[PDB]
Design a protein around this ligand. Structure first.
Ligand SMILES: [Fe+2]
Ligand SMILES: [Fe+2]
Lengths: 326, 329
């Protein structure tokens, strides 16, 4: 019952950096062991982002262990090591090089244009699944990966909550967390609603699930990095795409799962996300509106959004390839 | 501007005439080296050790630095500040009288030890409590009380959120999320408990400042300990403080009645009303987070050590408020 703890995951990685990280996470690890891990992780990430495919896979696997393991005794040092990797990653991402902050209208127009161009709804897999055309085995592929996107999303939102120093903005994220964790009934948290769906269609919903899909690991690593960033524009961009923009996927999948014979109660997970209300109309939009005049915020937000879309598209492409093969 | 940044780390550090304050500032630079950060950690640990071994100047200095590290609001330096804070926590926790139980107490014996400890640390009889409940406080003296209540209340929700982040079990994170929702005003952020308290302060002539910086040593000691406990990797420390703050406290009813008898309206004193509650601690839902962990002696030792330390720093804080209250009007 430690499958998603850091040391068992590191022991299963046949790489020298896994042993160095393990030593840095020991109870009496020295400052030098931790700095050594940080340096070798930063160099590994740099070599991988420069084109060494093996170093790339290796640093993504290690970053997955560092940022998303559940043994809280090592979390602070794990997050410290993860930041050494984030710093390299953010130097390599194409940055919104704006010199002057866009107008609020121009900023919104840029957002809508980028979303309309890179939205998950146009992917051939979205169309196929919404159509009702997935077989039971294909819906199992889809939902197995949905589990990984959903089951710990509330934790990433909580990291953003922690970094919103304004009490009213923390309150906005607290209202989100409250809804996401079931309001007064933890049985209806959105991870447990999805779990109920998975069990209804023959899958296990494992809260210690560990992903083996590279594109899924890359997606979760990026999402956790963005939501944890000290410049909250990164997290607000991802919050925006994950929760604020008109979801639309949830309603069409709900109809399709009921078409597939699941009951209304079993498919509740997709029902609860449906929402008519434009993104700027929502109250959480004020967290973004207030920061638009700041060009540093704009650059963080727009860079975050583009990177999120890149990793999300590669992830959806990989789910789709798996679905076509069953 | 200087006012807008007065609870940021670097402005606070530049006002601390401590050698180690410059070393911390260098460690917080955007491109600070691992050597600079390691040096700052070492110097802070040595300062904390010297203070806790009896050097009163080192004790005051390390506590001021820990206040800046753990509770400043410039998020850009927060991760390194918390990294440095832990070097201090490790020293602090070696010096705290800690429960050396060899095996776990029974549920009954655990509840009994908790209740006797809480009973024996009640402040219902404290001279300041009696002075305020009795009516006897002048307006200026009520202001002293509420000025410090502000520091206790206004960022409590953040400490609870650090505990939420460390509850890996989804149902337990949900329990803390329900607390946070209530604490941040449910659907109306104007009704968050800090803003209810701001309304009470405004009613009595005081400003409620969300960039407030404490200058009372016992108050700093209290906030430092509370943030340490809620952020601890062993959640027994946070559950101890959470339970004494939320599941047991049984205080707010008499302050509410005293304020109403002093001419404040129900709406002005709402901050105290919302806290009043009939239901025993075991009856509450959050108690399950504690009930599940009793069998684990490591949890019991963290929890009981945390409870005792919390009471020591809270009692010294309440004494210091009382001394200040008696210096006015
Ligand atoms: Fe949700
Ligand atoms: Fe409260």
């Amino acid at each position: 019952n430690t499958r998603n703890f850091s040391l068992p995951q590191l022991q299963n990685l046949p790489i020298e950096e896994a042993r160095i990280v393990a030593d840095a996470l020991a109870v009496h690890a020295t400052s030098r062991q931790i700095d050594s891990a940080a340096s070798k992780l930063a160099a590994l990430a740099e070599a991988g982002l420069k084109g060494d495919r093996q170093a790339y896979a290796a640093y993504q696997q290690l970053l997955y262990v560092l940022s998303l393991s559940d043994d809280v005794a090592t979390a602070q040092t794990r997050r410290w090591l993860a930041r050494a990797i984030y710093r390299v990653e953010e130097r390599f991402m194409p940055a919104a090089d704006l010199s002057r902050a866009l107008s609020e209208e121009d900023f919104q127009k840029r957002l809508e244009q980028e979303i309309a161009a890179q939205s998950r709804e146009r992917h051939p897999m979205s169309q196929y699944v919404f159509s009702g055309s997935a077989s039971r085995a294909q819906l199992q592929v889809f939902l197995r990966h949905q589990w990984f996107r959903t089951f710990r999303l509330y934790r990433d939102a909580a990291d953003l909550l922690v970094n919103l120093t304004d009490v009213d903005e923390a309150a906005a994220l607290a209202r989100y967390l409250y809804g996401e964790l079931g309001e007064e009934d933890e049985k209806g948290s959105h991870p447990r609603l999805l779990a109920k769906l998975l069990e209804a269609i023959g899958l296990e919903a494992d809260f210690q699930a560990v992903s083996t899909m590279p594109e899924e690991i890359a997606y979760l690593n990026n999402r956790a990095r963005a939501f944890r960033h000290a410049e909250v524009g990164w997290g607000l961009a991802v919050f925006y795409i994950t929760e604020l923009v008109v979801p639309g996927n949830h309603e069409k999948l709900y109809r399709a799962l009921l078409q597939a014979g699941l009951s209304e109660d079993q498919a509740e997970y997709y029902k609860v996300h449906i929402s008519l209300v434009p993104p700027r109309a929502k109250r959480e939009w004020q967290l973004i509106a207030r920061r638009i005049p700041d060009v540093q915020f704009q650059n963080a937000f727009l860079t975050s959004l583009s990177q999120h879309f890149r990793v999300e598209r590669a992830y959806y492409d990989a789910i789709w390839e798996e679905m076509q093969s069953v």
